[PDB]
């Protein structure tokens, strides 16, 4: 279909791309996966003129970096000069699927220059850094080292090429600022994955999205003691040839806080081939989830398990940002609706959000052991009965059904039956809270009245620990457990890009997102009638909290009212949607941004035609 | 005054309402672009 070599045929000639980022070969957050996945297509486009510049860490170097020798004489001269001038620079390959060249700069070996460099910055942009930050100073050192490397690389080159530099956060924006200060012949791009003030303002300050025009960013930046970081990010965004954000909602947020509209929006992608390695995996995972809920709810298995539906929400334990409270309120409302209308449906909701626990509680392990004992006893009696049936049927006689069971069988089954006696109700949490009084999820569960009662049509299971294949009572990793659920609910409030909903959608699982997140906006823009494809977009930007809860309840109830055929058709449509999130399609925006930067910095040699052409027409 | 402003920046007492506001930074940075 639409591949990289579609219409962007550009005269790259002698051009060098430097992918500057603080998080290459050094796992910290989420852009690490972005760069690691994008390296393959970037190297396919640029060949060997692609370098990733990052800080030097011992752990990362010994784990995933293979040190080599500089392949070009100019690079070797640059490395030798910088190493002899009082620095420490390493070169190698990043042991990832693309195998790109990596330049690693040790910021701990250049403290002596800090007192000088900190002055020079002030003599250039009137930006000062407090001595006690301990994280911005690393950014200053990294930026000065990157500018030094770029200048030396341009000086040592026999024929000077057109250099394109791409900085990825405020941690790397000082290098861009200094590149523009020294008037180096480079083309600068700046990408923001989340505006700095956004996460500060979402928590504490009220109505962040309804006061984007009433925010005096100087005041909030200064009062929170992050004024220098805000100035760094805004200066980096201001003096860049091309400015970019990873989502539309981030584009509005940056246009109102960084005072610059992005020239282009480049969404985050991923490699879908590895995820694709969908009904066989779904069936197996659903069977295992059925076994787990059989074990957990032992002694209370009075509801049909062929009419039960498995919802889930996953991610970091952010109660408001991940929208767990809205999910809980909607679950209570859906429980009331299911009880009132006299339905046979049951809904088991899972909350996989890490918290501060110690171990499992006794009830959960007890239930798993009870289920294992019953399964073993049933298999033993079944095998014995099958052998007896075969033997009695080989002689041409109908089995006397009142003698296939004997004394030890009845003993085993009586012990098994005695095992499943319980007077209490299943717990809503599978672990032991260290802060059970101050936990918000459990507090809301208690407030709204979901105690896994027999009359309740909605059961809730809160599983703090991450899902691991070696766990005693969920011996399965995250992906295979998710493949067996029916729906994923991510009603995010503050979310520049949703990695978890995108991963869920790639696996072929219907999902609920919002228009306050990057993934939700992307899917809303690229699909007509997304609900037919299994994506439910919750209008959370133009609605109140109660209206959002009501709409979520409507979505959940309408999902519960589908037939099995409708659910199958919806899940097939969701499955045929993964190619929209691959770097084979989402990597074209990066190409367009680089072309814009090249044409802006060197208009004599390059010219750009603003082709912004880049899908799912169905129903509506 | 100049160097004193840099010192105040170093100790963490910035004049985000007055001289240290981003207007000065932007008007100085606009010369390089």
UniProtKB/Swiss-Prot annotation, chain A:
Q: Please tell me which top-level EC class this enzyme sits in.
A: transferase
Family to which this protein belongs: Belongs to the glycosyltransferase 3 family.
UniProt-recorded name of the protein: Glycogen [starch] synthase, muscle
Q: Which Gene3D superfamilies match?
A: Glycogen Phosphorylase B
- Pathway it works in: Glycan biosynthesis; glycogen biosynthesis
Q: Name one GO molecular function term.
A: D-glucose binding
Name the CDD domains for this protein: GT3_GSY2-like
UniProt-listed Enzyme Commission number(s): 2.4.1.11
From Swiss-Prot, chain B:
What domain of life does the native source organism fall in? Eukaryota
Cellular localisation: Cytoplasm; Nucleus
Known post-translational modifications?
Phosphorylated.
Which body tissues produce this protein? Highly expressed in skeletal muscle and heart, with lower levels in brain, lung, kidney and pancreas.
User: What is the purpose of this protein?
Assistant: Glycogenin participates in the glycogen biosynthetic process along with glycogen synthase and glycogen branching enzyme. It catalyzes the formation of a short alpha (1,4)-glucosyl chain covalently attached via a glucose 1-O-tyrosyl linkage to internal tyrosine residues and these chains act as primers for the elongation reaction catalyzed by glycogen synthase.
From the record heading the sequence, give the disease linked to this protein.
Glycogen storage disease 15: A metabolic disorder resulting in muscle weakness, associated with the glycogen depletion in skeletal muscle, and cardiac arrhythmia, associated with the accumulation of abnormal storage material in the heart. The skeletal muscle shows a marked predominance of slow-twitch, oxidative muscle fibers and mitochondrial proliferation. Polyglucosan body myopathy 2: A glycogen storage disease characterized by polyglucosan accumulation in muscle, and skeletal myopathy without cardiac involvement. Most patients manifest slowly progressive, hip girdle, shoulder girdle, and/or hand and leg muscle weakness. Polyglucosan contains abnormally long and poorly branched glucosyl chains and is variably resistant to digestion by alpha-amylase.
According to its UniProt record, which protein family does this protein belong to?
Belongs to the glycosyltransferase 8 family. Glycogenin subfamily.
Subunit-level organization = Part of the GYS1-GYG1 complex, a heterooctamer composed of a tetramer of GYS1 and 2 dimers of GYG1, where each GYS1 protomer binds to one GYG1 subunit (via GYG1 C-terminus); the GYS1 tetramer may dissociate from GYG1 dimers to continue glycogen polymerization on its own. May also form a heterooctamer complex with GYS2 (via GYG1 C-terminus).
| Protein name per Swiss-Prot or TrEMBL | Glycogenin-1
User: What is the gene name?
Assistant: GYG1
Q: Which residues of the full protein are shown?
A: 317 to 349 of 350
């Amino acid at each position: 279909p639409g591949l990289e070599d579609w219409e962007d045929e550009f005269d790259l000639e002698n051009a060098v791309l430097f992918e500057v980022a603080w998080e290459v070969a050094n796992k910290v957050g989420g852009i690490y996966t972005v760069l690691q996945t994008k390296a393959k297509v970037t190297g396919d486009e640029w060949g060997d003129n692609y370098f990733l510049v990052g800080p030097y860490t011992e752990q990362g170097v010994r784990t995933q970096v293979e040190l080599l020798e500089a392949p070009t004489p100019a690079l070797k001269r640059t490395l030798d000069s910088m190493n002899s001038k009082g620095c420490k620079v390493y070169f190698g390959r990043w042991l990832i699927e693309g195998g790109p060249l990596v330049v690693l700069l040790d910021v701990g070996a250049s403290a002596w220059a800090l007192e000088r460099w900190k002055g020079e910055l002030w003599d250039t942009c009137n930006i000062g850094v407090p001595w006690y930050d301990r994280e911005a100073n690393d950014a200053v050192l990294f930026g000065f080292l990157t500018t030094w490397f770029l200048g030396e690389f341009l000086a040592q080159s026999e024929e000077k090429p057109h250099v394109v530099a791409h900085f990825h956060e405020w941690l790397a924006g000082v290098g861009l600022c200094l590149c523009r200060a020294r008037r180096l012949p480079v083309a600068t791009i700046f990408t923001t994955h989340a505006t700095l003030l956004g996460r500060y303002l979402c928590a504490g300050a009220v109505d962040f999205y309804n006061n984007l025009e009433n925010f005096n960013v100087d005041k909030e930046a200064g009062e929170r003691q992050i004024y220098h970081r805000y100035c760094m990010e805004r200066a980096a965004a201001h003096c860049a040839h091309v400015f970019t954000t990873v989502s539309q909602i981030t584009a509005i947020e940056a246009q109102h806080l960084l005072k610059r509209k992005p020239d282009i929006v480049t969404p985050n992608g991923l490699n879908v081939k590895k995820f694709s390695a969908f009904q066989n995996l779904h069936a197996q995972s659903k069977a295992r989830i059925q076994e787990f809920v059989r074990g957990h709810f032992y002694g209370h298995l009075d509801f049909n398990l062929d009419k039960t539906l498995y919802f889930f929400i996953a991610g970091r334990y952010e109660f408001s940002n991940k929208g767990a409270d809205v999910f809980l309120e909607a679950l209570a409302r859906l429980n009331y609706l299911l009880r009132v209308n006299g339905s046979e449906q049951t809904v088991v909701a899972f909350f996989i959000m890490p918290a501060r626990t110690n171990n499992f509680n006794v009830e959960t392990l007890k239930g798993q052991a009870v289920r294992k004992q019953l399964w073993d006893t049933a298999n033993t009696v079944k095998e014995k009965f099958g052998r007896k049936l075969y033997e009695s049927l080989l002689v041409g006689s109908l089995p006397d059904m009142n003698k296939m069971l004997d004394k030890e069988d009845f003993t085993m089954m009586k012990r098994a039956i005695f095992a499943t006696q319980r007077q209490s109700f299943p717990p809503v949490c599978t672990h032991n809270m260290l802060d059970d009084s101050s936990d918000p999820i459990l507090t809301t569960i208690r407030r709204i009245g979901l105690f896994n009662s027999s009359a309740d049509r909605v059961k809730v299971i809160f599983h703090p620990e991450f899902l691991s294949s070696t766990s005693p009572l969920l011996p399965v990793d995250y992906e295979e457990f998710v493949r067996g659920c029916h729906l994923g609910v991510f009603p995010s409030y503050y979310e520049p890009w949703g990695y978890t909903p995108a991963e869920c959608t790639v696996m072929g699982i219907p999902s609920i997102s919002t228009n306050l997140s990057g993934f939700g906006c992307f899917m809303e823009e690229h699909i007509a009638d997304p609900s037919a494809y299994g994506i439910y977009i919750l209008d959370r930007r133009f609605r109140s909290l109660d209206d959002s809860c009501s709409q979520l309840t409507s979505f959940l109830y309408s999902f519960c009212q589908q037939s099995r055929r409708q659910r199958i058709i919806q899940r097939n449509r969701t499955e045929r949607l993964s190619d929209l999130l691959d770097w084979k399609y989402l990597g074209r925006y990066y190409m367009s941004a680089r072309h814009m930067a090249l044409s802006k910095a060197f208009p004599e040699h390059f010219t750009y035609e603003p082709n912004e052409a880049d899908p799912r027409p169905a129903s509506v | 005054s100049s160097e004193e402003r840099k010192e105040r920046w170093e100790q963490g007492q910035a004049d985000y309402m007055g001289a240290d506001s981003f207007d000065n930074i932007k008007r100085k940075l606009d010369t390089y672009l």
